[PDB]
Design a protein around this ligand. Structure first.
Ligand SMILES: [NH3+][C@@]1(C(=O)O)C[C@]2(CC[NH2+]C2)C[C@@H]1CCC[B-](O)(O)O
Ligand SMILES: [NH3+][C@@]1(C(=O)O)C[C@]2(CC[NH2+]C2)C[C@@H]1CCC[B-](O)(O)O
Ligand SMILES: [NH3+][C@@]1(C(=O)O)C[C@]2(CC[NH2+]C2)C[C@@H]1CCC[B-](O)(O)O
Ligand SMILES: [Mn+2]
Ligand SMILES: [Mn+2]
Ligand SMILES: [Mn+2]
Ligand SMILES: [Mn+2]
Ligand SMILES: [Mn+2]
Ligand SMILES: [Mn+2]
Lengths: 319, 318, 319
């Protein structure tokens, strides 16, 4: 199959980045929904590397207020190794989460094989809090801080993160869907001059202009791999309610599909994260099914499924 | 009343273009909602040509996988005759469906009186499958194939369709709202070079640019008649749930009203189809009422009802 | 605090401008939701002038079809005096309604201190019916007609309104969100040549272009105080269902936040009305809260709360 439709699926059943149980069932519910089968139906070369075990770390005291540092640290270190293995096999790494702290490992591992990569971060949250700016202490709101080169000297020695080396510069990341940012995070976002399209920008410009600007900002100088880190809470909770930190006034089902359709069209998608699907956080069994279906739809669009339609290079009027 | 406000209403209680029962009740639920009365309230000259009787064809064997060919063929043939009669009487034909296979008859009947007409097709689906590309065999998903001049020779001899003559060229149709297109249909669109605004285009451009481009593509050379074929599943199932083939991520209530408001403003609406309203597919009685109300609102906008407001040519302050 | 964040709160528990009971509980439910506390949390200087006592007028006969004229007349006369007092104290007047007839008093009282003010009217309705064009006889659908200078000679001697002097010209008002306009109102709108962005315009242009044009139309010549009169039914009933006259196809939660965010950014907000919140019209206990939370969110955006985030002028990376 073509490069843009060759896929290495990694299940990352991990939850200790945040306090709500159930996010570790994300790989299980996404698979049961028939993700692998639906991708193979759209001419994809899919290989399943299974679910990473993430063996228990019973002795994992907090670093100041930062909860489960060694667990989050080790899960991300093993994900890095697995993502790098998938990348070396000439496959787009498809990380099924799991909480967004796993992005430390996903982007790090991807950058080991492709150091020139650019990040598109779809989320309601910046996840750029450092272990010292965080007020919650939940590492799922800190991944970007461990990855940025400009934040070196501002990240303290956190147990389980000594393997981490900042791999991305402030200029190679674009945020889309922002609407819930902490004071410390907003300060980081402005002082470093990170490119962002909050909900305000999406409202002002329209998702067409947002995507046109996002892709020109990151690819204008030179074509390079794209790493899309998709947090389902980035979409409005009317489409993805079964998630840990939902915020009203989010990206629509259409905007979510438009972002992913545009990234596919570049033929440069190299890494993908489908994060924060928590099937225990539905209010009804339908809310869970609605979130999973939306997450599956976003994923299919990342690998070629277009609303206008798709067809094989054959004559349909004379079979 | 003005030409843009003179209507000939045709009831088309037909369902055999698809397998789900209840879509034949569409003319009944749209009328009960007070469509005729509400149109007369907005200074429309309304003439009701009634509901067409669709006689049973008991031995209507399938053409390959294509279900009920003679039934779908005869219903359209009847609709074509009625639409032409309405058009000759200087009226805008308002077809109350019924499934989308009735578009074969609606557009054919309209083209007999106005051959230079342009088609605006609002829908989640292209309905351009031919009897040979179709996988479902449901005729409601093949009306455009029978109408296109470029597909002459690609349509086999289907029982009940020998009266059909392709009346529209690939350059005379614009699609709005596409989000569920079959491989064969996508091939047809691309090879014939049909103009389309799928949900991707609506997201990219905005409905303002979509309409500006749709109307310029069609009338740019000179003014010509407009046939709007409105399938309620073109709109999102949060506004029109009571329909046979609903697809998520659809046109909003606002986008639907914006398309119809822009078409009204041209004063060139000559034919209208309000299709696929199925009152048996509402999960609650409210889902049915919501779909009917949305369909009625779309129809009123086609004949002048504007969100900014409307007023009679009199002095309201004196 | 900053002028744009120095606020004076006025409670206006009044309902006799329409026939549905409960809209007088609007100030009570908005306060209970913690509006004052949330504003002080975003560095606002908040002063509460309390709830205006609206004494009963037992012998209130209708003027033709116009219901409760003296009651509506006296309530706005009382509000005008209070708004003017708040304005003289160098504060942004924040009127918590209450039905939209109170806009007669809110805009009048504001114009006594700032006569060059511009009005942004966020609503589904024009509220421009005169006491003679109205078919309902409900004064909350008439405040604009009492305020316009061009409609002087067309407003009859209505009991309780002799204190009223038209303070705004047709060129000084912009409508946003219109979708339910009476024939008489549409005639007034067109004959006077009032600037408006009905839902048709919002769909055509996008809220970005709508706001850019609204602010340019009013502030292009000279900076002037902005009076935002926000009726919650201007937003779609999926966000504000607990309201008297809901109309489908309204402004989204995002569009509402975008309008208010843009008005804040000018630093020229001088008067604000949060009207038609009726907690008795919520089909479930959930519908009231949704409407209330939405109204509180709109208000916070008017005084600085931004979706991209906010931060204090301190170095967060080096405390
Ligand atoms: N910035 C947060 C954090 O934990 O740092 C604050 C938060 C808790 C209270 N208000 C929202 C959650 C947010 C982190 C979001 C992490 B996510 O992976 O879902 O983007
Ligand atoms: N192209 C379809 C067909 O029946 O040909 C296939 C369909 C069934 C399963 N996938 C979508 C329905 C579609 C026909 C749509 C007809 B309609 O009037 O609703 O637009
Ligand atoms: N123009 C109205 C009026 O009473 O003037 C007519 C109305 C009643 C039935 N149809 C809509 C209500 C509208 C006025 C609404 C007042 B409001 O402040 O909520 O806009
Ligand atoms: Mn996240
Ligand atoms: Mn998030
Ligand atoms: Mn159709
Ligand atoms: Mn359809
Ligand atoms: Mn109002
Ligand atoms: Mn209103």
């Amino acid at each position: 199959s073509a490069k843009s439709r060759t896929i290495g699926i990694i299940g990352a059943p991990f939850s200790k980045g945040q306090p709500r149980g159930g996010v570790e069932e994300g790989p299980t519910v996404l698979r049961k929904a028939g993700l692998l089968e639906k991708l193979k139906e759209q001419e994809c070369d899919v290989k399943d590397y299974g679910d990473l075990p993430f063996a228990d770390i019973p002795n994992d005291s907090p670093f100041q207020i930062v909860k489960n540092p060694r667990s989050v640290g080790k899960a991300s270190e093993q994900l890095a190794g697995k993502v790098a293995e998938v990348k070396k096999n000439g496959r787009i790494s498809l990380v099924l989460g799991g909480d967004h702290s796993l992005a430390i490992g996903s982007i790090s591992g991807h950058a080991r094989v492709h150091p020139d990569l650019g990040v598109i971060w779809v989320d309601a949250h910046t996840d750029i809090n450092t272990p010292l700016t965080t007020t919650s202490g939940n590492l799922h709101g800190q991944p970007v801080s461990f990855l940025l080169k400009e934040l070196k000297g501002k990240i303290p020695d956190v147990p389980g993160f000594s393997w981490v080396t900042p791999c991305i510069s402030a200029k190679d990341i674009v945020y889309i869907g922002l609407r819930d940012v902490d004071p410390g995070e907003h300060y980081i976002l402005k002082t470093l001059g990170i490119k962002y399209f909050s909900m305000t920008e999406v409202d002002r410009l329209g998702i067409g202009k947002v995507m046109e600007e996002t892709l020109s900002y990151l690819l204008g100088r030179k074509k390079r791999p794209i790493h899309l880190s998709f947090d389902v809470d980035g979409l409005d909770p009317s489409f993805t309610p079964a998630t840990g930190t939902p915020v009203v006034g989010g990206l629509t089902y259409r905007e979510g599909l438009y972002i992913t359709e545009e990234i596919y069209k570049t033929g440069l998608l190299s890494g993908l994260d489908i994060m924060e699907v928590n099937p225990s956080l539905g209010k009804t069994p339908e809310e869970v099914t609605r979130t999973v279906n939306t997450a599956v739809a976003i994923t299919l669009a990342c690998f070629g499924l277009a609303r206008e339609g798709n067809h094989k290079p054959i004559d349909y009027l004379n079979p």
